[PDB]
Amino acid sequence: GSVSKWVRLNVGGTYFLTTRQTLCRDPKSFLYRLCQADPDLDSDKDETGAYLIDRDPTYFGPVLNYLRHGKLVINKDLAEEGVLEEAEFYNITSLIKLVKDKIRERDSKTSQVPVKHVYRVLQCQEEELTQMVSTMSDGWKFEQLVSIGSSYNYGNEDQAEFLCVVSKELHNTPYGTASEPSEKAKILQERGSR
Amino acid sequence: GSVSKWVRLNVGGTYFLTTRQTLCRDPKSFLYRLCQADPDLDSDKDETGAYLIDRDPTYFGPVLNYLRHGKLVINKDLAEEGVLEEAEFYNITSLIKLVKDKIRERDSKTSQVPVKHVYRVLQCQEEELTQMVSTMSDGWKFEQLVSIGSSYNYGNEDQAEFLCVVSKELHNTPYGTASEPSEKAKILQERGSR
Amino acid sequence: AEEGVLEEAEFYNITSLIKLVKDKIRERDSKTSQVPVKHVYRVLQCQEEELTQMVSTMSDGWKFEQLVSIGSSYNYGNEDQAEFLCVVSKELHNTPYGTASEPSEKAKILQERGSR
Amino acid sequence: MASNNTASIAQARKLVEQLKMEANIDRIKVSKAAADLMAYCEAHAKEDPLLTPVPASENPFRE
Amino acid sequence: SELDQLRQEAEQLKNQIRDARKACADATLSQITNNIDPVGRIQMRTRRTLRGHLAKIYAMHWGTDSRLLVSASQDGKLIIWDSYTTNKVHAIPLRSSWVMTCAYAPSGNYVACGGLDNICSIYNLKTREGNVRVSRELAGHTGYLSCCRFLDDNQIVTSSGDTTCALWDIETGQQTTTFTGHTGDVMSLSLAPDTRLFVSGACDASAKLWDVREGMCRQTFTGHESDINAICFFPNGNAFATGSDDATCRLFDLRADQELMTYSHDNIICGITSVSFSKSGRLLLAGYDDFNCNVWDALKADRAGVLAGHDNRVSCLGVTDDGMAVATGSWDSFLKIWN
Amino acid sequence: TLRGHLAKIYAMHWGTDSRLLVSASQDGKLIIWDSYTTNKVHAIPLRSSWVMTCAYAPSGNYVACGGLDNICSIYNLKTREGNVRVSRELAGHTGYL
């Protein structure tokens, strides 16, 4: 017989014993190509027959975990990139997709660490000032106030007396901000642009 | 394997030497049914007799310590989601009910985007300007100061010459931000607003 | 996990080390806490000429926050000490410091005098 | 689906139904409806602040 | 294709409707009775200059109290004005700019807004905290939010793009009764004073009257060739004016199921942008993309009055809930109160 | 003319000395006015606005105020650092104070 309930492998000098049935989760796996017995592939340590593969022992772990229970997981210190490259070596596209998504999220968090900051200008006269500053809407941060020579009175007590610039953040560091299309939306945007 | 007080668990291919009683702390554990000596289970190494568990040895440790002393402490490098899914796998409803509490704290602590920022507009003349600026209430941060021309005392030296915008941060997003209802308070609010 | 080794010690019942570990736990929690550090703000008032100097010679540990011109009437306002109000601030680590109050009788009546 | 022109059976059905209820809708004659609306407007024309010039002692803009 | 039979059924039912309307079509007694109750030459005076806004005032809106009018700029700020004192009760910055609709609750408590963000936000004006905080966000209108209106302090209608006027349960944030009968996106929505029938216009020029209770399209009106911009429901709930991209405006009637009468002139060529009804509804006040805005005798189609020009196109009209005055939200960033 | 406030003044309680009167604004700021010099002895930015009542201790060492937050705030005017600080927050109520 050729079936092995528990086959032994040497990944980077480290021994891994697992069922070939688990090793056959994806027929694209290099390990599946190991499952079949062929003359072109019979290299092993003759002491116990465990096949010799010169690949990393560490990042092979998450691959084995997913292959055993269909869930990928990499520690907060393990190199997502390293496991990506290793799984590419074993040609497991399923993990390549999800590891790629995780790496994309981490890259977005790192690169988009500047959260999109929305800003606004509120025009108020002195009398109306204190209230809107105090009642300033939750989730927003005051940024700057400036005074102008009012059109009426001695540069004061007019609807154009003060401008208060405020701002806030949009939590777009780990997620992707985007836009969407619409036709009448474009028409109206053009109408308002001029 | 064989019956023994010591139990050798080959979790993810890594041996954990613990007590059957620790595993038998509660019956909700799937490990409880593993501890049964019936021949129903055979997923054990034939070279050492250790029971082969294909789950994560890393997130197995938190569960083992919880079963040892009834509390789960997650290593800062291991995500609480991993221990969550682990305890789900072994079906410890109490433990799930606690790790979810851990998440309920962590996610409330982070991403507290609308951390209350109360802004006020103190009006002062330069004479007392330094007085209150020096004596700003502890916890309040000065943010802006603006002069405004006035017709009194050549503008300056008037109590309304300067407006000092001050702010204070306040944590209620991580402490359950909300409001309270009161019918007479509502009546007074509408009375004053107009 | 600091609390992890704490519980490990509790199991092993090393009373002195448990004391030390919970003392360190309390210290870490206090220093982290909600960062109760308090910022103290001062109003330095200097002319433009000396403005560059006292900004440059600004005392390490202190932070510049804002500079405000004054509609002063002395020499168009410029070249005058009261022309500008440079308000600065510096933080005080409240948990290390505490920022508490104490009684002082003559100092109490002095506080009363200086209040008015 | 596409063969049914995006299930055009349903779109035709709802169109037919809406036209059906439109048919069931009473048709108050244009002269009659105009008379009714004119009567209501007149019943309210004498009280409309815009139509009825308010003196500059009650409006909230020259109060 | 059996669909031929179904489309023929639709066509012949439509012809039946046309025939019924023609039977309904008698002499328009109102314009025939032009001699009776002529609104005369009304000269309407502006009295307040709510110049606090800076961006274009896309949509204004009054309040049930008939004193506080909420207006939205293009830049994303809502100004709840105090009409009678020129004061600004509030000034709300909006998470996303490009807003064209401002909705005031039927209480004076909540305000809703929406725009190209494809989300309608509802802000609680009155809260224990003493400030204005966003209460609810409504997403699902994949298209832009064109116009919204508050049925209740928990029920709101949001005429949007994506060809829908979904009725939103504020608390759950869930749209309850969809209105999918339209083909072109919706840029208008007018509530009956009964608050049971609302008329929505779209780029298909199909002013569909809907029943709030079921989502069914109660009626369809098509007297306008171009896209419909603004609908002002008649004070009785039995008829409504409807303006379209054309320079013309046409008053339709629910009972007549057909355009009661039309409002157009040679000198006016700019597309309509806002339609309004006086306290009685006898005055049809219309805002144009022309800087000037006018008012017609609603039952005589003649120019009842002309409003003093602005520096830019008018963009929204709102009469006082009592009809005391009317505010003209124009693109020159000035709301003008007219009485 | 103690024209220092800019919001509505909801309460004004004198001090036993009959020289310092503490007043509260609608927007949440307390001004310990100096009646004889029209000079702001103190400006106190309240944590939460909508305060209707301002209380002055008999000793002039404390000021209390109450708002829609339903928590009475007790401010210790006299502290070593010289900056007014919140002394006590009185919770337990539910209605506006």
Side-chain angles (χ1 to χ4, degrees):
Chain A
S2 50
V3 75
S4 286
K5 182 62 182 178
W6 270 327
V7 74
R8 217 159 176 96
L9 180 60
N10 207 355
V11 179
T14 68
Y15 264 44
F16 293 92
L17 189 75
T18 182
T19 85
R20 306 188 315 122
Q21 297 85 29
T22 58
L23 297 176
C24 291
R25 290 290 287 278
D26 60 315
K28 62 185 156 52
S29 47
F30 168 79
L31 314 155
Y32 153 41
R33 179 50 180 74
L34 302 177
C35 288
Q36 51 220 84
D38 54 305
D40 195 16
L41 166 78
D42 206 28
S43 55
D44 43 21
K45 186 159 172 183
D46 57 344
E47 305 294 305
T48 193
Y51 283 17
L52 300 171
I53 174 174
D54 295 333
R55 283 316 297 167
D56 69 30
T58 71
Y59 303 101
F60 168 75
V63 184
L64 206 52
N65 318 343
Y66 175 93
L67 167 140
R68 284 178 301 219
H69 59 39
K71 197 66 231 72
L72 62 136
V73 51
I74 42 185
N75 294 102
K76 265 190 284 177
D77 48 18
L78 199 67
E80 57 279 294
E81 312 314 317
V83 63
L84 187 57
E85 319 325 317
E86 190 55 277
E88 285 186 349
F89 185 92
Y90 296 80
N91 159 5
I92 330 305
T93 67
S94 48
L95 287 318
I96 292 157
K97 176 57 202 191
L98 275 74
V99 177
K100 268 314 198 184
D101 304 349
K102 175 52 193 70
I103 289 167
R104 204 72 63 255
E105 173 277 294
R106 158 246 200 164
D107 291 23
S108 75
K109 150 193 49 47
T110 45
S111 175
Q112 293 179 292
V113 66
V115 279
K116 316 307 172 297
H117 300 102
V118 179
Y119 298 76
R120 291 289 195 274
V121 167
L122 311 99
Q123 161 46 259
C124 55
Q125 54 180 4
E126 31 180 277
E127 290 71 35
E128 301 172 341
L129 176 53
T130 51
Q131 43 281 70
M132 47 156 287
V133 187
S134 312
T135 61
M136 186 310 306
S137 292
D138 304 350
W140 285 80
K141 340 289 165 191
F142 179 102
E143 285 314 290
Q144 161 158 20
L145 166 62
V146 297
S147 204
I148 325 295
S150 275
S151 91
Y152 144 83
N153 250 7
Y154 159 55
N156 48 38
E157 319 234 342
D158 215 26
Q159 190 64 239
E161 172 66 1
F162 280 112
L163 299 69
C164 155
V165 181
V166 300
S167 81
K168 74 181 282 159
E169 83 158 87
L170 325 182
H171 170 256
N172 300 354
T173 278
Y175 309 130
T177 174
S179 279
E180 289 78 32
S182 165
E183 324 318 296
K184 197 61 203 286
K186 295 142 180 38
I187 297 161
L188 293 152
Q189 285 196 94
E190 163 295 339
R191 274 196 158 153
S193 281
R194 55 224 189 94
Chain B
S2 47
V3 61
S4 192
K5 189 57 63 168
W6 316 282
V7 49
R8 188 183 172 104
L9 307 154
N10 215 352
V11 185
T14 86
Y15 300 110
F16 294 78
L17 182 63
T18 185
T19 318
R20 303 254 300 286
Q21 313 320 124
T22 52
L23 314 183
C24 292
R25 168 171 177 269
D26 68 81
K28 339 192 293 295
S29 47
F30 140 73
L31 288 313
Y32 164 45
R33 301 84 163 180
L34 286 176
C35 284
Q36 313 320 292
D38 39 1
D40 304 357
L41 173 77
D42 211 1
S43 75
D44 64 334
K45 234 173 209 192
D46 67 336
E47 311 297 323
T48 191
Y51 294 118
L52 271 155
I53 328 295
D54 284 20
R55 296 283 280 147
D56 173 18
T58 73
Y59 294 117
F60 168 85
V63 185
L64 187 47
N65 87 61
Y66 171 81
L67 280 168
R68 278 155 169 157
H69 86 298
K71 273 305 300 208
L72 203 172
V73 282
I74 51 172
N75 288 281
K76 298 166 177 179
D77 72 298
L78 256 63
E80 65 276 303
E81 310 311 303
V83 303
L84 199 50
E85 53 86 20
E86 227 57 68
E88 285 275 313
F89 176 68
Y90 327 105
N91 165 77
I92 314 298
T93 68
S94 44
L95 196 45
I96 295 143
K97 183 53 185 179
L98 261 293
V99 183
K100 290 164 163 173
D101 307 358
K102 153 62 185 52
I103 299 144
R104 284 146 48 177
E105 168 157 60
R106 163 181 50 82
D107 288 350
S108 72
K109 147 179 54 55
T110 67
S111 61
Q112 41 185 263
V113 185
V115 155
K116 337 195 283 298
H117 286 0
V118 175
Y119 300 77
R120 303 285 207 247
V121 178
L122 329 170
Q123 174 185 280
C124 42
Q125 46 176 246
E126 73 290 357
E127 304 89 317
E128 305 137 55
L129 161 58
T130 178
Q131 163 144 264
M132 74 294 292
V133 170
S134 300
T135 56
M136 291 324 317
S137 308
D138 264 17
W140 283 85
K141 329 297 191 205
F142 168 96
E143 291 317 307
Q144 279 281 312
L145 164 60
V146 168
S147 160
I148 43 187
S150 309
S151 60
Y152 332 114
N153 200 332
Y154 179 47
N156 45 10
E157 313 170 40
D158 189 45
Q159 89 297 330
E161 172 53 42
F162 290 98
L163 315 180
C164 164
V165 173
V166 309
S167 99
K168 141 180 308 305
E169 57 85 14
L170 286 167
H171 293 183
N172 214 7
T173 316
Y175 295 76
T177 173
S179 279
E180 294 64 34
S182 168
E183 81 296 330
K184 258 307 306 183
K186 285 154 209 138
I187 293 156
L188 296 166
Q189 277 205 21
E190 322 326 294
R191 172 147 321 96
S193 316
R194 49 94 185 158
Chain C
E2 159 156 33
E3 311 286 13
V5 284
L6 180 272
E7 285 179 312
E8 190 61 274
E10 302 289 8
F11 166 103
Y12 288 121
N13 219 58
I14 174 55
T15 62
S16 303
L17 164 144
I18 291 158
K19 169 58 173 168
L20 168 64
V21 169
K22 55 202 182 40
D23 298 6
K24 164 63 183 58
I25 280 154
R26 279 136 42 206
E27 172 180 4
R28 156 211 78 193
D29 300 345
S30 66
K31 77 171 157 31
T32 50
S33 61
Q34 331 282 310
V35 197
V37 311
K38 302 303 190 279
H39 292 26
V40 48
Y41 298 72
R42 297 290 202 253
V43 180
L44 322 170
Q45 173 257 280
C46 57
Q47 77 175 160
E48 50 219 64
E49 312 161 56
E50 320 162 50
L51 160 55
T52 174
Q53 158 276 340
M54 51 42 58
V55 169
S56 307
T57 58
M58 188 302 321
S59 311
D60 271 8
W62 279 86
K63 285 293 193 243
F64 174 94
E65 301 298 74
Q66 196 193 341
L67 169 65
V68 175
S69 164
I70 313 300
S72 323
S73 49
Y74 190 77
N75 179 231
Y76 200 80
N78 54 37
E79 303 179 359
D80 184 38
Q81 306 324 114
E83 188 29 59
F84 273 89
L85 270 50
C86 158
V87 314
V88 304
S89 92
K90 83 159 295 177
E91 92 199 88
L92 328 165
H93 308 343
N94 195 18
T95 298
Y97 299 156
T99 317
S101 286
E102 295 86 354
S104 283
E105 294 70 42
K106 278 292 323 286
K108 282 163 199 119
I109 53 140
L110 287 162
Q111 285 206 76
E112 161 268 341
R113 292 147 170 183
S115 292
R116 53 213 64 259
Chain D
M1 85 321 299
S3 100
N4 210 312
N5 314 1
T6 88
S8 156
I9 42 152
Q11 287 87 65
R13 170 52 51 214
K14 55 96 178 178
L15 195 50
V16 158
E17 182 47 83
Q18 185 195 140
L19 271 303
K20 283 161 144 51
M21 310 98 65
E22 288 171 74
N24 314 337
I25 282 160
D26 156 33
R27 303 280 182 289
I28 285 302
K29 266 57 195 297
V30 153
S31 46
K32 171 53 197 58
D36 176 23
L37 300 164
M38 171 155 188
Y40 157 74
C41 283
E42 296 154 297
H44 288 42
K46 333 299 168 197
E47 53 191 299
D48 173 10
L50 306 166
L51 285 167
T52 321
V54 174
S57 47
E58 195 270 350
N59 73 112
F61 324 102
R62 286 88 30 76
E63 199 95 307
Chain E
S1 178
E2 196 271 359
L3 303 170
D4 58 349
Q5 330 188 299
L6 320 182
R7 59 188 54 113
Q8 168 47 47
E9 176 59 69
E11 137 64 26
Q12 63 206 14
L13 276 152
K14 161 188 50 43
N15 200 35
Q16 137 62 46
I17 291 310
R18 300 186 288 224
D19 309 358
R21 293 183 192 194
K22 301 153 199 149
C24 183
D26 306 355
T28 305
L29 176 83
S30 54
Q31 55 79 16
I32 295 306
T33 51
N34 38 5
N35 39 331
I36 300 154
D37 197 10
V39 300
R41 201 49 209 165
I42 317 104
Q43 297 332 106
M44 172 37 49
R45 171 58 32 73
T46 178
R47 325 190 171 280
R48 315 268 191 165
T49 307
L50 285 51
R51 43 171 65 171
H53 261 298
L54 290 169
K56 299 168 183 306
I57 324 167
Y58 271 16
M60 71 76 88
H61 185 261
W62 281 93
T64 50
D65 63 333
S66 73
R67 184 174 164 131
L68 306 191
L69 57 102
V70 53
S71 47
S73 88
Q74 188 189 288
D75 83 82
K77 67 180 184 203
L78 290 150
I79 310 189
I80 290 88
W81 286 87
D82 177 6
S83 47
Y84 301 172
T85 63
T86 75
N87 306 151
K88 172 189 328 301
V89 182
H90 280 86
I92 314 313
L94 281 80
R95 200 200 85 102
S96 292
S97 173
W98 276 127
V99 306
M100 324 76 88
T101 169
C102 57
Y104 218 161
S107 53
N109 293 119
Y110 283 33
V111 163
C113 54
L116 314 184
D117 201 1
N118 318 315
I119 293 183
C120 175
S121 56
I122 313 89
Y123 295 100
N124 171 22
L125 302 173
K126 319 301 174 168
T127 192
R128 190 274 321 158
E129 314 251 12
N131 50 57
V132 175
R133 162 201 33 239
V134 75
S135 308
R136 292 297 318 156
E137 88 305 340
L138 310 156
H141 271 306
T142 64
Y144 63 104
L145 270 288
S146 73
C147 199
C148 312
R149 272 304 187 286
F150 268 125
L151 256 298
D152 203 57
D153 293 19
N154 195 73
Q155 277 324 108
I156 200 189
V157 283
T158 64
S159 51
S160 86
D162 190 29
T163 73
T164 313
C165 296
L167 187 102
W168 294 94
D169 170 8
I170 281 171
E171 177 35 61
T172 62
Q174 304 306 123
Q175 65 281 58
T176 321
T177 81
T178 79
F179 310 85
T180 51
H182 259 93
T183 60
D185 47 12
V186 199
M187 315 64 57
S188 201
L189 185 142
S190 195
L191 279 194
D194 186 19
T195 80
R196 308 282 74 172
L197 290 319
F198 71 89
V199 48
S200 44
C203 275
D204 57 25
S206 65
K208 297 187 154 69
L209 178 85
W210 309 81
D211 192 337
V212 304
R213 298 303 318 145
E214 306 77 358
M216 62 77 67
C217 168
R218 172 68 49 85
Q219 278 178 273
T220 305
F221 296 67
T222 324
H224 269 297
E225 60 278 43
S226 55
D227 173 24
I228 280 161
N229 277 329
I231 323 169
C232 176
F233 210 134
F234 184 78
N236 270 0
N238 44 16
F240 56 81
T242 294
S244 164
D245 213 20
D246 59 2
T248 307
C249 177
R250 311 168 195 290
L251 158 59
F252 302 73
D253 179 69
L254 278 61
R255 305 182 273 118
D257 196 16
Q258 72 194 294
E259 182 206 309
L260 176 51
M261 184 266 260
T262 185
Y263 313 89
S264 199
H265 214 270
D266 60 345
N267 41 16
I268 53 100
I269 319 93
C270 305
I272 213 75
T273 166
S274 41
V275 290
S276 201
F277 268 127
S278 47
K279 160 68 152 297
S280 52
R282 190 162 191 96
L283 301 168
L284 192 292
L285 312 93
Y288 304 85
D289 313 329
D290 181 0
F291 305 159
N292 174 28
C293 36
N294 313 306
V295 53
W296 317 82
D297 204 334
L299 304 108
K300 314 198 189 303
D302 53 326
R303 183 152 296 184
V306 58
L307 318 177
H310 291 231
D311 211 16
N312 195 306
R313 71 155 55 199
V314 181
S315 192
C316 205
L317 268 159
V319 278
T320 317
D321 194 23
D322 83 338
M324 162 46 98
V326 51
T328 59
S330 324
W331 268 12
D332 53 3
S333 304
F334 305 147
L335 300 99
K336 304 304 294 317
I337 282 288
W338 300 86
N339 180 59
Chain F
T1 306
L2 284 53
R3 36 183 296 271
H5 278 278
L6 303 169
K8 288 174 179 315
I9 319 176
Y10 271 5
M12 46 140 292
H13 183 215
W14 284 82
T16 58
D17 74 358
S18 66
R19 163 167 193 141
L20 308 183
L21 60 99
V22 53
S23 60
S25 83
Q26 187 174 239
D27 76 88
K29 79 181 190 269
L30 284 151
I31 303 187
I32 307 185
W33 287 91
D34 170 7
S35 46
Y36 311 159
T37 69
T38 85
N39 290 354
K40 288 182 37 52
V41 180
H42 280 106
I44 326 296
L46 280 310
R47 196 189 81 87
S48 304
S49 168
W50 274 128
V51 294
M52 318 64 85
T53 178
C54 54
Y56 213 164
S59 54
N61 310 4
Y62 285 73
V63 166
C65 56
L68 310 184
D69 202 358
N70 326 298
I71 293 195
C72 202
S73 42
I74 325 298
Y75 281 81
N76 161 220
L77 321 178
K78 310 312 197 320
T79 207
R80 201 55 174 150
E81 303 83 78
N83 42 29
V84 187
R85 211 165 56 81
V86 165
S87 42
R88 290 307 302 229
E89 75 309 334
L90 295 173
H93 266 85
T94 55
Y96 73 108
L97 319 183

